[PDB]
Design a protein around this ligand. Structure first.
Ligand SMILES: [Zn+2]
Ligand SMILES: [Zn+2]
Ligand SMILES: [Zn+2]
Ligand SMILES: [Zn+2]
Ligand SMILES: [Zn+2]
Lengths: 185, 329, 109, 263, 265
């Protein structure tokens, strides 16, 4: 899905403009490329070029890496993280939980996403009170079921006013919020 | 707290594309230039001995819009000209900072070199890594205090604190006026800062000796017509139209007594007057500062003269007059 | 920064603790007092470890027989390394407060 | 409109010396001339408003915040208020031999803020062009230089014209003051005929001052002197802290105590 | 390499003032010109630095029996899906790689400021204080006492152009240009002469240039009065004497310091 979106953007002029605004980095299955790309990514954050690291939620990079101040400032989530519904391994794991412990397939399936999504979006708040905004580019997160299964600390900050901001509307609040955090305590 | 009275400050303005965005009520570039013009004149009006020089960076290249000079009008003219600038390209801190470094490298040690980068587009495409340039700046003791716009850029954060400067982000247009005006005042001298005596020259206004006898005709020194009378130099002996201006030959600063006296009040900051809203046995209806009835429950008083001042009086006194009227007696 | 926790008095290296930490420590002590397995969540990636580590150390001193030792597991060796730094800092703070070495051992496999 | 402020320098030590000398000119006439100038000023237009300030060795007190003789009611209040107030200040005054020099810097200080107070309250629709018609009458004090210079700069930024009218003496500081802000400087030598000057030189306002012939400005000697001697010096060696004009190169300037490093 | 010749050619006609003054020092054969200087597309360019492969191809594929337009065409030209991601990482990495080249103050005397550089019995106060107190028991004498016509008339006459307190030529235009050019010439050569004059520079190598520069003052000043003579013998009006003071004052500093140097020795 990442490649398809990347290719689609590449055909249009959207991808090129993003390259102009900021450097762009992408993740691959091979670990060797991932380490080099991330190693370069850190340098870009230090410098003023910036970087946009595309990655996969299940990627070992997402779990292994930790984002701190001036690293992964704004975590962007493109789509609710769901595993493919064809891998037969999950079925025995999934359907069994329905038979034993009485968990609905959708409940665990959605729980498999919010936990996975929360894992890959809770890094920006590592420590030392370093500001950061977590934007989830999917209307599914706006559903009450997703919001409830979201961790309490993130959810309580979230409000209905900004729950379903438009792309233009979401950008404007992001700009304003960063201003407030820029000034000292 | 030691203060560096003389300072060569560069207001690096970025001609980046992001300046096109009209986040402020007028165009972002125009608002800075319009307000920066206020800063330029005010800066000279609060530090005559100092001089300023503007660098404009765009399309990954830095061009000196106006070299160091002591004439506020000359710099002001450049600002208005830049209002029509195309404003297309991408800035380069290394290019901009390097240009400032080259001209400021040869500046005298006693004067406090400073740079105020008005950063607009968060990106910084530079030919060389900027962290290396930081090492040079600290050795060159050039203070760089960025004022970011709509972004808390990381690289400039270390730039300000490592180099000694301060980092800020514009909360709004009203807050923007506050920030630049703050930088107008000379910054305190830190441990790295060193002070040294500087040669100074005081000219006297001169005119025709007696009925244009043994006159001293001359045109100017930086379409000037003949001048019957004007300022001169102890050493250049070259006519100067306006002061204060650096010698074009001696290299020794020319400046009259009043200009120096304009900077004395910095050495003598006015202690803030306690605000006591209640009357506090102040039976004088008329404000001593302005001889006007106190229409608000606010009063200010010194620790020496113990006088009474209304809101306008105290606000004015600390802001511009920089001295207590009654407490002078 | 000695904290007079409801269960006992607990030391702490950093100067201040947010209200969540108070809620964290008291809830953790309740599970320890009940001597029953449980689960809890803390937002901060860092800060919980020192609060989690500090409370266990204080509980060990009060009831050494209750708890033989602490087995604190982390996902990855690069990550677990950051934990021992937190523990190492805490011991020096506690050692300075006590002023002498105590029979306490901490190691990572 | 225009808000005039007349800073009359009524120094009893100097003015009283005239009374002892029994000279033709007296403080009473000086107040009357200034009174007339204020009355004539407000005469110019209804929107115009004025004020007055007196100077004494101790302090400065404002002299200004029916038709019995068939007079204009408003100016009548001005005539009565100033006459009553000026006599009270002169009649009652403590004696301090230590301090006798006339105070002017503080007197101006009250004016500058006063104009600022008026400038705030007045409606933004009408623009106010303030002015200060300083009328010195005695020699200035050396110790007042620093304070007096600051107020003059404050006037420049605030756009107020200091129209000095020194008489019987040329105070180099005051003539230096007026030049910075562009105010006129007239040294009347005929004290009895002082009033003819004001209605012709000072009375016309900045709006019409340019389109009018007035006495040329006097050359200003912007002298500089070392703190050693107070003598004219053309080359000064200031430091980066004191910003003080000194005589000759020294290992360390006394007013700084800085650890200057030779080179 | 003849770098100096290239620089002169670049500024030979680009800047008139710089070459106009430099030639003038040689128009009259004052001194050698050696001391003069001694003392004082984007897309291809981005690709040039962006892709080392293109740089290697360009060197190997330098135009030979081909056209630049064709070279432009060659630029743009699951297996392909992964190529774009790899190219962006490499292209982005290359772009990043290209950009990474291998005191509280205290004082003891504050009263000094209060009386800055500006320069400068007991019963008399009592006599004046009481005498003035009795002055204004009478007030509002304005009717006649404030002014008199006889005194008033004199004041107006004084305000006349011939009166007291009221004291009261652009004929040459083409001469203006000539004078401006001469003044600039003085500044260029004075600048270097005064560049190290104020500093003592008690060093053998530092002092030599001053001696050479000091001698150059005689040479440059040797020709200056000759041009003055031409201008002087026109109308003998509007004397130009300001230029002389600079030369004599420069001479006075030269001779006075020369005597001081001898005195120090
Ligand atoms: Zn000079
Ligand atoms: Zn007041
Ligand atoms: Zn006071
Ligand atoms: Zn001296
Ligand atoms: Zn000093």
């Amino acid at each position: 899905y990442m490649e398809s979106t990347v290719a689609s953007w590449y055909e249009q002029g959207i991808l090129e403009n993003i390259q102009r605004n900021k450097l762009l980095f992408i993740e691959t299955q091979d670990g060797a490329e991932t380490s080099v790309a991330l190693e370069k990514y850190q340098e870009a954050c230090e410098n003023g070029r910036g970087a946009i690291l595309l990655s996969v939620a299940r990627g070992k990079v997402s779990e292994g890496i930790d984002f701190v101040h001036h690293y992964g400032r704004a975590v962007i989530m493109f789509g609710v993280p769901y595993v493919y519904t064809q891998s037969r391994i999950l079925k025995a794991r999934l359907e069994y939980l329905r038979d034993q412990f009485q968990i609905r397939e959708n409940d665990f399936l959605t729980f498999d996403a919010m936990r996975h999504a929360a894992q890959c979006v809770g890094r920006a708040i590592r420590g030392k009170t370093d500001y950061g905004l977590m934007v989830f580019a999917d209307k599914r997160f706006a559903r009450g079921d997703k919001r409830g299964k979201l961790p309490r600390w993130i959810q309580e900050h979230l409000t209905d006013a900004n729950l379903n901001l438009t792309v233009d509307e979401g950008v404007q609040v992001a700009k304003y919020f960063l201003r407030q955090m820029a000034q000292p305590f | 707290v030691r203060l560096g009275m003389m300072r060569h400050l560069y207001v690096v303005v970025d001609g980046s594309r992001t300046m096109e965005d009209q986040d402020l009520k007028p165009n972002r570039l125009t608002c800075t230039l319009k307000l920066l013009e206020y800063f330029v004149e005010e800066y000279f009006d609060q530090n005559p001995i100092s001089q300023i020089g503007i660098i404009v960076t765009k399309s990954k290249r830095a061009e000196k819009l106006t070299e160091l000079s002591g004439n506020p009008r000359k710099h002001i003219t450049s600002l208005k000209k830049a209002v029509d600038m195309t404003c297309h390209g991408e800035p380069s801190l290394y290019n901009s900072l390097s240009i400032a470094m080259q001209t400021l490298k040869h500046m005298p040690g006693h004067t406090s070199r400073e740079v105020l980068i008005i950063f607009s587009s968060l990106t910084t495409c530079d030919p060389s890594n900027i962290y290396d340039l930081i090492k040079t700046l600290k050795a060159a003791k050039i203070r760089v205090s960025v004022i970011g716009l709509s972004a808390e850029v990381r690289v400039c954060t270390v730039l300000a604190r490592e180099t000694g400067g301060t980092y800020h982000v514009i909360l709004d247009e009203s807050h923007y006026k506050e920030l630049l005006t703050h930088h107008v005042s000379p910054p305190p001298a830190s441990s790295s800062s060193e002070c040294s005596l500087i040669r100074m020259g005081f000219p006297q206004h001169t005119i025709a000796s007696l009925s244009d006898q043994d006159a001293k005709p001359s045109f100017s020194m930086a379409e000037p017509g003949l001048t019957l009378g004007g300022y001169f130099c102890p050493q250049c002996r070259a006519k100067y139209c306006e002061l204060p201006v650096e010698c074009k030959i001696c290299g020794l600063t020319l400046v009259s007594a009043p200009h120096l006296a304009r900077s004395y009040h910095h050495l003598f900051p006015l202690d803030a007057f306690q605000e006591i809203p209640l009357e506090e046995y102040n039976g004088e209806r008329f404000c001593y500062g302005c001889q006007g009835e106190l229409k608000d429950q606010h009063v200010y008083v010194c620790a020496v003269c113990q006088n009474v001042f209304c809101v306008d009086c105290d606000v004015f006194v600390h802001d511009s007059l920089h001295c207590c009227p009654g407490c002078i007696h | 920064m000695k904290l007079n926790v409801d269960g006992l008095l607990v030391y702490f290296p950093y100067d201040y603790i947010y209200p969540e930490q108070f809620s964290y420590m008291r809830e953790l002590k309740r599970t320890l007092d009940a001597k029953g397995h449980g689960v809890l969540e803390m937002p901060s990636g860092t800060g919980k470890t020192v609060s989690l580590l500090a409370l266990i150390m204080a509980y060990q001193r009060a009831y050494p027989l209750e708890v033989t030792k602490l087995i604190y597991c982390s996902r990855t060796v690069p990550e677990i390394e950051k934990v021992i730094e937190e523990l190492r800092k805490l011991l020096n703070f506690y050692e300075k407060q006590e002023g002498e070495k105590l029979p306490f051992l901490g190691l990572a496999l | 409109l225009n808000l005039l402020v007349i800073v009359v320098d009524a120094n009893p030590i100097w003015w009283g010396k005239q009374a002892l000398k029994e000279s033709q000119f007296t403080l009473s006439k000086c107040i009357d001339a200034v009174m007339v100038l204020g009355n004539s000023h407000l005469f110019m237009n209804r929107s115009n408003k004025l004020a007055v300030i007196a100077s004494h060795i101790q302090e400065s007190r404002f002299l200004y915040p029916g038709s019995k003789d068939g007079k204009y009611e408003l100016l009548t209040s001005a005539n009565e208020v100033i006459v009553e107030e000026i006599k009270d200040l002169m009649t009652k005054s403590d004696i301090k031999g230590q301090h006798t020099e006339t105070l002017l810097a503080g007197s101006l200080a009250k004016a500058l803020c006063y104009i600022h107070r008026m400038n705030k309250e007045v409606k933004d629709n009408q623009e106010m062009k303030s002015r200060i018609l300083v009328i010195k009458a005695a020699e200035d004090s050396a110790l007042q230089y620093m304070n007096f210079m600051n107020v003059i700069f404050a006037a420049q930024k605030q756009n107020i014209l200091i129209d000095a009218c020194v008489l019987d003496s040329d105070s180099g500081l005051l003539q230096q003051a007026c030049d910075i802000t562009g105010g006129l400087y007239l040294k009347v030598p005929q004290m009895p005929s002082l009033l003819q000057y004001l209605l012709w030189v000072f009375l016309p306002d900045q709006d019409q001052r340019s389109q009018l012939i007035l006495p040329p400005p006097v050359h200003v000697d912007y002298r500089a002197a070392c703190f050693c001697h107070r003598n004219l010096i053309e080359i000064g060696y200031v430091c980066s802290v004191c910003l003080s004009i000194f005589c000759n190169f020294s290992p360390i300037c006394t007013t700084c105590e800085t650890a200057f490093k030779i080179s | 390499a003849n770098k100096e010749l290239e620089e002169k050619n670049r500024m030979l006609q680009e800047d008139p003032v710089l070459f106009q003054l430099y030639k003038d020092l040689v128009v009259s054969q004052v001194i050698s010109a050696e001391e003069f200087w001694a003392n004082r597309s984007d897309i291809i360019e981005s690709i040039f630095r962006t892709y080392p492969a293109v740089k290697m191809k360009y060197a190997e594929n330098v135009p030979h029996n081909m056209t630049e337009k064709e070279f432009w065409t060659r630029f743009f030209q699951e297996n392909s899906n992964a190529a774009i991601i790899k190219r962006f990482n490499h292209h982005s990495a290359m772009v990043l790689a290209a950009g990474l080249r291998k005191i509280a103050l205290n004082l003891k005397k504050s009263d000094r400021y209060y009386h800055g550089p500006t320069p400068i019995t007991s019963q008399d106060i009592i006599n004046s204080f009481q005498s003035i107190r009795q002055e204004m028991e009478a007030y509002t004498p304005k009717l006649t006492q404030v002014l008199s016509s006889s005194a008033a008339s004199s004041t107006i006459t004084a305000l006349s152009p011939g009166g007291a307190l009221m004291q009261g030529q652009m004929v040459p235009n083409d001469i203006q240009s000539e004078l401006k050019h001469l003044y600039v010439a003085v500044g260029e050569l004075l600048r270097h002469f005064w560049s190290c004059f104020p500093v003592n520079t008690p060093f053998l190598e530092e002092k030599v240039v001053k001696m050479k520069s000091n001698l150059e003052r005689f040479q440059v000043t040797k020709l200056c009065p000759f041009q003055e003579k031409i201008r002087r013998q026109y109308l003998s009006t509007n004397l130009v004497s300001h230029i002389e003071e600079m030369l004599q004052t420069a001479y006075n500093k030269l001779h006075t310091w020369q005597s001081r140097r001898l005195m120090k020795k």
